[PDB]
């Protein structure tokens, strides 16, 4: 409603770096807000794509940003009569970024990994890796829970059980208020998908460079399954956290598996021990229900509510014809210990192939009316198909069925305006929470500042 679509702010990265593929707000120890941006196709030293991260200071003018430097060299360690190998070529560093405290976590879901022993190998596969940094101190660390030293032969002899070779850890990411990192690994356990959790403190204190294979004792990985419903489900395509069990001391995880149960799609809510509390099933096959998830109390009862995106949902129209437009589902948490019922609201896109629901960002209370609001992206929506972001306001009964404001892409066609979003942070410190929008197709980020309500 009260975002400013006239005077925007533009940050930009290198051409063809997909600058803006992922982003987040970052507050230093002094409380100064910045914008971290992932550019998963940024060139490295060997003039090859490796990805990269940028830490943009807040300036109303915008402009170029300084790199947040990480190690981009391929590593090798001959140890235990084995040879450990990491390959960072086309790893996609910055394919996801998240900030917590004065710490930044940027991940390369496609960092490859192999182990050699004489003539055998563990196979060169994308286990993924996460790079962590404390900019003010310069401290660095890594986390790659899916790395292993098991040989190809063993996996075959054990019928490919607990195969973490393709985890692609860092695909999605989130951090609990307690400082516990949680990585979605859609390729884990042979493309079933897994989650990997570990305290940020324990990551830094257990990491040393050159080791490549090290133990993080406090970590916690989810489990393999014999159930075909989970096969090729990409469990961990998206991840979020919240409070859904009434216990304020426990933290619950929200996981998206958009191809769960033969492309039906699903979202699961779990305790910190990965025991399932709820499961939301997709309404339509191949809709990619669970492509994106968001957690925020929209109706002001102090109970978190769940939003789920199905960007490829095909709406039923006249003459038995369908039209891919995307859809968003709202699930309001009930009072006390009860199961999340049917969707409280269905928001459906209008533009064909617009992919409404590709991204969903909590805005906090935008108009300051007392109910938290959200922003939904249709990256190829709008009349021009250039992309749109739609704002929906909270209310006593959930959300408004109609948008209060629509942000048309200021970029050219193919910019994927809205593919990444983030809100609920006051960046100019005017008392109103603001919205940052990524457009990797254009290698830029747009900042929308919230003003007083007209």
């Amino acid at each position, epitope marked *: 409603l009260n975002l400013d679509p006239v005077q925007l702010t533009f940050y930009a990265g290198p051409n063809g770096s997909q600058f803006g593929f992922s982003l987040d707000f970052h507050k230093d120890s002094h409380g100064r807000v910045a914008i971290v941006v992932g550019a998963p196709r940024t060139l490295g030293p060997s003039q090859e794509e490796t990805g990269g991260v940028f830490l943009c200071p807040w300036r109303a003018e915008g402009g170029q940003c300084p790199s947040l430097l990480f190690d981009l060299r391929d590593e090798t360690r001959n*140890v*235990g*009569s084995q040879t450990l190998q990491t390959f960072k070529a086309r790893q996609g560093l910055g394919a996801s970024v998240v900030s917590w405290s004065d710490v930044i976590v940027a991940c390369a879901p496609w960092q490859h990994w192999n182990v050699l022993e004489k003539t055998e190998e563990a196979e060169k596969t994308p286990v993924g890796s996460c790079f962590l940094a404390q900019p003010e101190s310069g401290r660095r660390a890594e986390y790659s829970p899916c790395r292993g*030293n098991t040989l190809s032969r063993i996996y075959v002899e054990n019928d490919f059980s607990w195969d973490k070779r393709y985890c692609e850890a860092g695909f999605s990411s989130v951090v609990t208020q307690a400082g516990e990192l949680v990585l979605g690994a859609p390729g884990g356990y042979y493309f079933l998908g897994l989650l990997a959790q570990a305290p940020v403190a324990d990551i830094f204190s*257990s990491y040393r460079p050159g080791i490549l294979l*090290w*133990h993080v004792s406090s970590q916690s990985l989810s489990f393999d399954s014999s159930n075909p419903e989970y096969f090729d489900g990409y469990w961990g395509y998206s991840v979020a956290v919240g409070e859904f069990d009434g216990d304020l001391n426990t933290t619950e995880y929200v996981v998206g598996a958009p191809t769960w149960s033969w492309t039906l799609g699903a979202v699961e809510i779990l305790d910190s021990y990965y025991q399932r509390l709820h499961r939301l099933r997709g309404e339509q096959m191949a809709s990619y229900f669970g492509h994106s998830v968001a957690v925020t109390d929209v109706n002001g009862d102090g109970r978190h509510d769940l939003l789920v995106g199905a960007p490829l949902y095909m709406e039923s129209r006249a003459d038995r014809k369908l039209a891919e437009v995307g859809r968003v589902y709202l699930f309001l948490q009930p009072r006390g210990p009860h199961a999340l019922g049917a969707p409280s609201l269905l928001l459906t896109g209008t533009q064909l192939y617009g992919r409404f629901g590709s991204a969903i960002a909590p805005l906090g209370d935008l108009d300051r009316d007392g109910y938290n609001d959200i922003a939904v992206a249709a990256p190829y929506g709008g009349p021009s198909g250039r992309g749109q972001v739609l704002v929906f306001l909270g209310q006593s009964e959930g959300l408004r069925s109609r948008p209060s404001q629509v942000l048309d892409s200021p970029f050219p066609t193919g910019s994927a305006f809205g593919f990444s979003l983030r809100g609920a942070v006051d960046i100019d410190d005017n008392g109103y929470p603001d919205l940052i929008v990524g457009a990797y197709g254009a290698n830029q980020v747009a900042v929308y500042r919230a003003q007083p309500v007209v």
Partner: antibody, heavy 119, light 108 residues
């Protein structure tokens, strides 16, 4: 806190067999490798072998192939070292070892188990 | 197997002295080495891993260094507790192998 609590001192005859233990405390035995090391005053320290208690796969120094047999039961959180066809040279102190962070290191040590073979 | 020649076998030194134990491998081991401490009539405690990294709880007066096949353990300002046995261990290859050992003794 990590502590490796091995069995008490054993006292056996030659030709017999013995099975030591190494119970984990403050952690899960399954997390890391578990090595066994032999110590004598003259010959010094020697590496017997290792095991990954998560799957039971083992490795041995070809010197101890036949005498040493390393195993583990994740249930009791314990790792074992069986010795067979004992002799006077097997008279030594035996330690179980696991790494701290590095997958391949040798950092945490149990108090040790004294063995004496004699008729 | 890889041999580990640890030297010296022993040394007579006093409190506050700075000393250095060395270790020579039969081939390159690229910093894949660990240092150990066995106090008289007791078990072992980890000091170093991967050549230079201090084990948790270990004072910073200890320090590891070296590369290739030559490595060293240095103790700045000897404490009364530091008088004990020390061993180096390589894990570049299986089987793991240890050094002959080094014993620190009080000089007089």
């Amino acid at each position: 806190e990590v502590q490796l609590q091995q069995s008490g001192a054993e006292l056996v005859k030659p030709g017999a067999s013995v099975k030591l233990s190494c119970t984990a405390s403050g952690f899960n035995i399954k997390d890391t490798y578990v090595h066994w090391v032999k110590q004598r005053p003259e010959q010094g320290l020697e590496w017997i072998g290792r095991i990954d208690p998560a799957n039971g796969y083992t490795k041995y120094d070809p010197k101890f192939q036949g005498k040493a047999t390393i195993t583990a039961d994740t249930s009791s959180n314990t790792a074992y070292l069986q010795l067979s066809s004992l002799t006077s040279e097997d008279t030594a102190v035996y330690y179980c070892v696991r790494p701290l962070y590095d997958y391949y290191a040798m950092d945490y040590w149990g108090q040790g188990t004294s063995v004496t073979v004699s008729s | 197997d890889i041999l580990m020649t640890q030297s010296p076998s022993s040394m007579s030194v006093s409190l506050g002295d700075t000393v250095s134990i060395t270790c020579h491998a039969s081939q390159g081991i690229s910093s894949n080495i660990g240092w150990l401490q066995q106090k008289p009539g007791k078990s072992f405690m980890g000091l170093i891993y991967y050549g230079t990294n201090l084990v948790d709880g270990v004072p910073s007066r200890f320090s590891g260094s070296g590369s290739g096949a030559d490595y060293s353990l240095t103790i700045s300002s000897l404490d009364s507790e530091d008088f004990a046995d020390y061993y180096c261990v390589q894990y570049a290859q299986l089987p793991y192998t240890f050094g002959g050992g080094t014993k620190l003794e009080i000089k007089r």
